[PDB]
Amino acid sequence: VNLLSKGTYWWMNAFIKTAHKKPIDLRAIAKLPIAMRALTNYQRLCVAFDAQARKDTQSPQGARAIWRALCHAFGRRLILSSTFRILADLLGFAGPLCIFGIVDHLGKEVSSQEFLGNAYVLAVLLFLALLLQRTFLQASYYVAIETGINLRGAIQTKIYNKIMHMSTSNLSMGEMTAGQICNLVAIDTNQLMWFFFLCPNLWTMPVQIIVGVILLYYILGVSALIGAAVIILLAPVQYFVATKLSQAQRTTLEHSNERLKQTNEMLRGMKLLKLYAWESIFCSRVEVTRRKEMTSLRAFAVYTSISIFMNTAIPIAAVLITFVGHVSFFKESDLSPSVAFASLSLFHILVTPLFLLSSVVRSTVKALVSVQKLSEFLSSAEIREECVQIIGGFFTWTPDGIPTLSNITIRIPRGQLTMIVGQVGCGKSSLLLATLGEMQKVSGAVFWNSNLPVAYASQKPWLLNATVEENITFESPFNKQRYKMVIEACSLQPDIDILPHGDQTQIGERGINLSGGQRQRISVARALYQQTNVVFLDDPFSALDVHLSDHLMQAGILELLRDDKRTVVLVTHKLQYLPHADWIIAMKDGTIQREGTLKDFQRSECQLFAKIPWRACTKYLSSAGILLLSLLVFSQLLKHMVLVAIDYWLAKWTDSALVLLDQSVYAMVFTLLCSLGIVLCLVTSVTVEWTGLKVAKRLHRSLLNRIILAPMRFFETTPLGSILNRFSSDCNTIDQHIPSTLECLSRSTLLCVSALTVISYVTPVFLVALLPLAVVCYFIQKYFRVASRDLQQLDDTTQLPLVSHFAETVEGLTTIRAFRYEARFQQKLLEYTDSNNIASLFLTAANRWLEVCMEYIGACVVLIAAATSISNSLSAGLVGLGLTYALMVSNYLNWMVRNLADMEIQLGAVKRIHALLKTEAESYEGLLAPSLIPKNWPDQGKIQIQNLSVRYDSSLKPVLKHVNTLISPGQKIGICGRTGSGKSSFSLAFFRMVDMFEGRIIIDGIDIAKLPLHTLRSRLSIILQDPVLFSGTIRFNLDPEKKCSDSTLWEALEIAQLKLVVKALPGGLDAIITEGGENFSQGQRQLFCLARAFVRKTSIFIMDEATASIDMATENILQKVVMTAFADRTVVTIAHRVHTILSADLVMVLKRGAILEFDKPETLLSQKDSVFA
């Protein structure tokens, strides 16, 4: 890696010259460099622990031990970054001296004093200095970022390894949870990282302050000292204010997150919601919640207003009160223009320190908190790194207090089938997990030679977020026949058909979390597939289904078939393999009788069984409102148009002081002129604050109404998370941190134009050099927008699977400890951790390369503006604007490009306008061939199917073919359709929610074509086969409607046997329906929906195929509700198990992908005959 290029990043050239042609992948990203490989960085830091193992006063480690480690860990390279930061800031001060030396020499008409003569000389010295000044600051930024990158994994590995020695009794799910270590990755690493991003500056920024003060003092003196203290002492007002901003952010998330959870609630069961036709109330609850969310973001704006304001006003507010003190209150010194310009030059320089200092103080304190949160975590209880026998042990599920099981001996040699049974809890999975060694074995011995002289599945499912076949893999090689000898041997093929892509589907997170009869079944699959010797399966009949338990007996018969002298030692509860078992159970509350033979046992007990241009107009010009957007224009214009003009006065009035109406009268004019922008800047801060507040209020209102009427076929076709990705991230983008980018950029780019416009007006042949120059400025930017985008979205796709690895590492901790797969997963830890760090490198690479290449360009401006500006002799005050803006180009094009880059990312959120607005269909009501129709009630259950020819999506295949059917009042049609072509296709279709390609549907006599679907589909009962539990209040779960009752609400739900089962409600008839059906049953969950079906008062309850019913007695109570509570209408008995066809009134077995036969009466035909089959 070559050194002057290691200065200015020349290796990035061919990278980005690559990047204009091809898009960029992780393959286009590289290997890690030798030191940047994370395990090396981990390696040195463990040595730093061993170094302070020599100290060992109280070595938990602890925080005092940590920072003594970390300083001697990374500090040498940190010193090098600090040294460049110092020397650069020192030459940061030298430029102002150069300005002073020019104008002082140019008020006029070998020795070093003579060598200090010429503005030729001093300007060239200025240029050649300001190369280094504008270079070593981008060394010192760089190396410090290439320090925190080397922090990241070298912390994260220590974290992850302590997870590899973590113990799990109550602490692992109590005080600290998966989230509580997850944010500890997600925050406290970055708290450390941004600390070491800023760690030089806390050493150094006050030295920049004090030497800025002293090099102001040798310009004015006591007027310097009285002027400086505003800008010095007023920066911790930012430390006051941003504290309130953090307080507002705490107010933000605490009010946003539950709302977003309720948005996910409204979105997940959106099909049932529009099936309930309940978009209005469900959206209205989020709408009035949003009113308070806006009221919180109101203060978020009021906080973020003055941050900008005091960041911008206090420069001028210092500079004027500095000068009026030098003019009025003191009046001693003559005021040269050289003074007056370079005074402002330092004033421009010193702020870019000063309003980072609060963020420094914040981050330093936050990280010093976070190291304690790291430490007091990190010194918690380890997991005691130290045939299947147990020789008389004393095990404890607890840590070293009260034991759980003593005197426990067991033995399981090879070639053996053994379960363990008893009472749950005491062996919920307990004694098997005690065999794992995941308990405080206070005494006794145990033998596998597993550690020193292994498969498992947990009683809770801990799957992985991957492909389903990859979840079946669980760090395995491939054998697709053996996989067919597993997956088909598990019979997950129906669940694989329920998956959209089967073996290539999306298991874990972002997928339908099915039952353990799928999920834990897939775990038992990866268990059996694992090609291990000994297995420990856990009570899978509790997770299985009934016929799945029959297949689980068959899977046990495939297990022992697959047990080619294996040692699978399961445990269960049922009496199924109580006949078929090699050895026996032992659990009463501890060691029950042994595994040998139930002959001499108590078996009687067991025998009981480019850019985005128009999108900104879609942001603003469609939604801003014109008058405030015009104020956003004009206030931005007229602020800077008087700001640089205040500097234009600030030269020439002192040029008259260099000469000699009244200049003291000129000064108070200038004073109030400086006060004018000080007045304006408040309205400038209030503009974008109020603007983005109004923008996001209507934008979120619009997207709410946009999704509020969309058809359900879309939502089945839409991946629901891709919608909520527009609601979670993009909304918070548009609210919390969209417009500050704009307010920065509108402050930025005008000043970028403006300083050029000044130096143009100074020298009329400036622009002749600018025109080749700004070419280069543009073409570097034009390449740059490609790269910084592709890095930034790369970043976005990178640390997310990194912490996803953590979450699975938390949850499936036990099972990887069982497989002893830490070596695999520490490797695959790195395999992400690397790709984070190398992406972060190339991000922070072009983060440097851009501005340093643009910075030399800015320096070229300086010299050219100087050399042109020599001819003002051939006036002299008007030089001083040139010099003061020549040096002030840099922070401008620093931000003026980078923010324009990040605006493109900020626009990528509001790209989802088209995902919202353009996607719009399905006017629900409003067709309405009558305006007057009280047959939304109907007392006549004679529906009709007037040769209705429906298509599914009007895309691939029809559902019917001219079905000229009808219905009779009381004719409860037992629905019998195709096993894979027409099952659900006649209920939501009967709610007109599909592409009925021909044929009408007469309802209460009249066709349902032009009728209010909001009125029709809400006054029609349908108890579908999805668990519909709207979280909230109990009356809100029961009756969130207009004519809500409590007597009838307590009547039919007692007829549903829920208002008497939950008669001990916490709030009674207005109780809280907490968690959306996590405390109530799975059966009364639907019985409350049956009471809602009573509440519609048109009880033609179109039920669905309730294939997941736990109690068949509860389904018989539902049959009693079909008997007693269904008031003799056309119950469309959709049945995946045709057992419920036993109560047929007038069925229509319309099947084989078609309309087979009207099944009434006595139709025990080839489906009802094969209903037993």
Residue numbers in the entry: 222 to 330, 346 to 622, 678 to 744, 770 to 925, 994 to 1044, 1059 to 1272, 1277 to 1575
Give me lines lifted from the publication on this model.
KATP channels are gated by intracellular ATP and ADP, key features which enable them to regulate membrane excitability according to the energetic state of the cell. In pancreatic β-cells, KATP channels composed of SUR1 and Kir6.2 couple glucose metabolism to insulin secretion. The SUR1 protein has an N-terminal transmembrane domain referred to as TMD0 that interacts directly with the Kir6.2 subunit, followed by a cytoplasmic loop termed L0, and then the ABC core structure comprising two transmembrane domains TMD1 and TMD2 and two nucleotide binding domains NBD1 and NBD2.
Recently, we found that carbamazepine (CBZ), an anticonvulsant structurally not related to SUs and glinides, also corrects KATP channel trafficking defects and surprisingly is effective only for mutations in TMD0 of SUR1. Thus, an intriguing possibility is that CBZ may bind as a dimer to occupy the entire binding pocket. Alternatively, the result could be explained by a CBZ molecule having multiple occupancies, and what is observed in the reconstruction is an average of the ensemble. Due to this uncertainly we did not model the CBZ molecule in the structure. To our knowledge this is the first protein structure determined in complex with CBZ.
